[PDB]
Design a protein around this ligand. Structure first.
Ligand SMILES: *[C@@H]1O[C@H](CO)[C@@H](O[C@@H]2O[C@H](CO)[C@@H](O)[C@H](O)[C@H]2NC(C)=O)[C@H](O)[C@H]1NC(C)=O
Ligand SMILES: *[C@@H]1O[C@H](CO)[C@@H](O)[C@H](O)[C@H]1NC(C)=O
Ligand SMILES: *[C@@H]1O[C@H](CO)[C@@H](O)[C@H](O)[C@H]1NC(C)=O
Ligand SMILES: *[C@@H]1O[C@H](CO)[C@@H](O)[C@H](O)[C@H]1NC(C)=O
Ligand SMILES: *[C@@H]1O[C@H](CO)[C@@H](O)[C@H](O)[C@H]1NC(C)=O
Ligand SMILES: *[C@@H]1O[C@H](CO)[C@@H](O)[C@H](O)[C@H]1NC(C)=O
Ligand SMILES: *[C@@H]1O[C@H](CO)[C@@H](O)[C@H](O)[C@H]1NC(C)=O
Lengths: 49, 148, 238, 88, 99
């Protein structure tokens, strides 16, 4: 039960195919429609975890 | 017993910390300097890394012209372009329709040619009082005719 | 003399600027593999992807570097010198094509056609029974240099562990391919080594005070590979 | 177009990101351009700041630095295409 | 007349504009931006030792838990602001309405 929680938390620092792994970091330095598809990759990856 | 939602403690304010502001740009060198090079032999003013505060620019010698062809005056201090290409010279006031993309004429194809794809700020003002004293500097030369 | 010697467990530097305590972090970057060949020069070389200078003597061995591409003409070369008061990390090039002087008094005898100098960075002098090490890694126009100031106790390689700390990083933006060494700080000897860097995976160990104290090469022998998989320094029977 | 920002992209005509219509170009350079400049009708170059989608402002010359009207002329030509097209 | 052209190149930018700063607060849930690092939490005085080249610390699960103030070199701790679930205890609504 300890390993599963540690693995779950460490999945928050994975790019999953986007520019970065921080929500507001890509929110600022990116085009608002361009940033829409980047958030999609992070959401789909974190749902699968 | 049912679970409905979650509770959070909202932040009370926002805070920002950044290092000491040092290494001001060479823009102070042109300050307290009421003379520089000519238009054809324009003085090079390449700028290395430095803090790009521009408020003092608007204070010393209030500029008649403040419009920026490439950028906006509001979007002035936010930018962090790699370097600076600053060119300055002395021009006639009646030649106002000569410093812009186009309007090729006396100063364009004979003196230094202003690039059409300008990405900076156009600053111009009448500095006759600060430069042209009673004696005058009529010995100064500028091209009115050429062959290239 | 182009002799060779075992590199042992040397050439570990701090990979980033992150504090850690009592953790075993498994990184993946450029490193010098354990037990490799070292060309023990005594009396011109490709840059590759980094070097490991180890010129020690006792007090005075090396006093210059070039780190250029063409080493002549007007191509930018990251000339690096040092003395008792300051270093000169400057983008300014001579013509070279000659052996610099080995005086024990000024820059004469080394420079011939000193042209424009673009960058003129100056900082604390490099110098702090002395061992001096170096790593010259460049990526995305970032010249990163590391250092260490352990005293020399053995005339051979002082077997042990050391961790190079960052010294300075500069946004140069140029690419280099060759380099030269300047020495003598008159019959004598000048001990001097050099290695090379390859991509590798390492398992570093941090104590609770944030100082790297050990490492394991993950592609050396079957035992070392097992430790990286388990992320531990002890393997039980199995 | 939705999203992209800069100069008149959001200073005057801020197109919402949820746009659904179709953009059509009608170029009749000769008809809607004077030989020396369409100074009759002007564009707001340097206003205060941006504005929310589908917002119309008509007040002018009230703002001044802390400049007058920011209408920096037209200089159009009936034959010029780059920098002078009417492009309705 | 002076014209300054804002050229740019793939090499790292050199001339950035002026940067501002604010005060510092402790034991209060507040948003922070420490030299380009963003986050929220409560900042308190730390008791850890930093080598004089590192900036911030990370825990085992790679989450920031310590920072260094760029104005005055001092180490600060970061703790997230409190959160949790909420439950409602009720009897039968056919009987009463208290919760
Ligand atoms: C010193 O100045 C010279 C010019 O006097 C620089 O040479 C120019 O460098 C720029 C950018 O590096 C090039 O775009 C030009 O084509 C170069 N011109 C010539 C004639 O070489 C030089 O880079 C400066 N710095 C050094 C270290 O020499
Ligand atoms: C930055 O300014 C503050 C002002 O009080 C000063 O205390 C601090 O020492 C400065 N930073 C450095 C690195 O000296
Ligand atoms: C700055 O300008 C004033 C103008 O009167 C002058 O007195 C002063 O010497 C100048 N300072 C310089 C050039 O450093
Ligand atoms: C050009 O600028 C430099 C740097 O400020 C200055 O030393 C020099 O006197 C200037 N030349 C002329 C002709 O103004
Ligand atoms: C180091 O020596 C040579 C390098 O010339 C190399 O071929 C060899 O494998 C290395 N190891 C030993 C033990 O010689
Ligand atoms: C080291 O070199 C610098 C070069 O600027 C020189 O000024 C200094 O005197 C030198 N050190 C000694 C001890 O001479
Ligand atoms: C870490 O630092 C503390 C305080 O300086 C010291 O007591 C402790 O021994 C250090 N740990 C080491 C050197 O492993």
């Amino acid at each position: 039960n300890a390993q599963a929680l540690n693995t779950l938390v460490k999945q928050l620092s994975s790019k999953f195919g986007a520019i970065s792994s921080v929500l507001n970091d890509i929110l600022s330095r990116l085009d608002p429609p361009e940033a829409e598809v980047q958030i999609d990759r992070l959401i789909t990856g974190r749902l699968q975890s | 017993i049912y679970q409905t939602s979650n509770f959070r403690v909202q932040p009370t304010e926002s805070i920002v910390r950044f290092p000491n502001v040092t290494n001001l740009c060479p823009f102070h060198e042109v300050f307290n300097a009421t003379r520089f090079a000519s238009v054809y032999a324009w003085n090079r003013t390449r700028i290395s890394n430095c803090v790009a505060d521009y408020s003092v620019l608007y204070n010393f010698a209030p500029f008649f012209a403040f419009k920026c062809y490439g950028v906006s005056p509001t979007k002035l201090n936010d930018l962090c372009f790699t370097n600076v290409y600053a060119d300055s010279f002395v021009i006639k006031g009646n030649e106002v329709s000569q410093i812009a993309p186009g309007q090729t004429g006396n100063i364009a194809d004979y003196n230094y040619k202003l690039p059409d794809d300008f990405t900076g700020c156009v600053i111009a003002w009448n500095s006759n009082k600060l430069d042209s004293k009673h004696s005058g500097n009529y010995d100064y030369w500028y091209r009115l005719f050429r062959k290239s | 003399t182009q002799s060779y010697t075992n590199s042992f467990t040397r050439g570990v530097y701090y990979p980033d600027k992150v504090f850690r305590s009592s953790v075993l972090h498994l990184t993946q970057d450029l490193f010098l593999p354990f037990f490799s060949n070292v060309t023990w020069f005594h009396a011109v070389l490709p840059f590759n992807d980094g070097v490991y200078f180890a010129s020690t003597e006792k007090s005075n061995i090396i006093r210059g570097w070039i780190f250029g591409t063409t080493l002549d003409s007007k191509t930018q070369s990251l000339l690096i010198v040092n003395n008792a008061t300051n270093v000169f990390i400057k983008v300014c090039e001579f013509q070279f094509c000659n052996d610099p002087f080995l005086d024990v008094e000024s820059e004469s005898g080394v420079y011939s056609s000193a042209n424009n100098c673009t960058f003129e960075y100056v900082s604390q002098p490099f110098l702090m029974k002395n061992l001096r090490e170096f790593v010259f890694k460049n990526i995305d126009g970032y010249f990163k240099i590391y250092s260490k100031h352990t005293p020399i106790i053995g005339r051979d390689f002082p077997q042990g562990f050391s961790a190079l700390e960052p010294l300075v990083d500069l946004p140069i933006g140029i690419n280099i391919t060759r380099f030269q060494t300047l020495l003598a700080l008159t019959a004598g000897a000048a001990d001097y080594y050099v290695g090379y860097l390859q991509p590798r995976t390492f398992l570093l160990k941090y104590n609770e005070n944030g100082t790297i104290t050990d490492a394991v090469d993950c592609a050396l022998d079957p035992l070392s590979e097992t430790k990286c998989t388990l992320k531990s320094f002890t393997v039980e029977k199995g | 177009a939705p999203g992209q920002t800069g100069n008149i992209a959001d200073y005057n005509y801020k197109l919402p990101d949820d746009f659904t219509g179709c953009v059509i170009a009608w170029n009749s350079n000769k008809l809607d351009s004077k030989h020396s400049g369409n100074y009759d009708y002007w564009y707001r170059l340097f206003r205060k700041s941006k504005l929310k989608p589908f917002e119309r402002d008509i007040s002018t010359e009230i703002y001044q630095a802390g400049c007058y009207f920011p209408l920096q002329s037209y200089g159009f030509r009936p034959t010029y295409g780059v920098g002078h097209q009417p492009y309705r | 007349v002076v014209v300054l052209s804002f050229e740019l190149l793939h090499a790292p930018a050199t001339v950035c504009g002026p940067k501002k700063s604010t005060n510092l607060v402790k034991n209060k849930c507040v948003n922070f931006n420490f030299n380009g690092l963003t986050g929220t939490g409560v900042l308190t005085k730390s008791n850890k030792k930093f080598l004089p080249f590192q900036q911030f610390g990370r825990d085992i699960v790679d989450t920031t838990d310590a920072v260094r103030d760029p104005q005055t070199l001092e180490i600060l701790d970061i703790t997230p602001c409190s959160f949790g679930g909420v439950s409602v205890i009720t009897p039968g609504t056919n009987t009463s309405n208290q919760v």
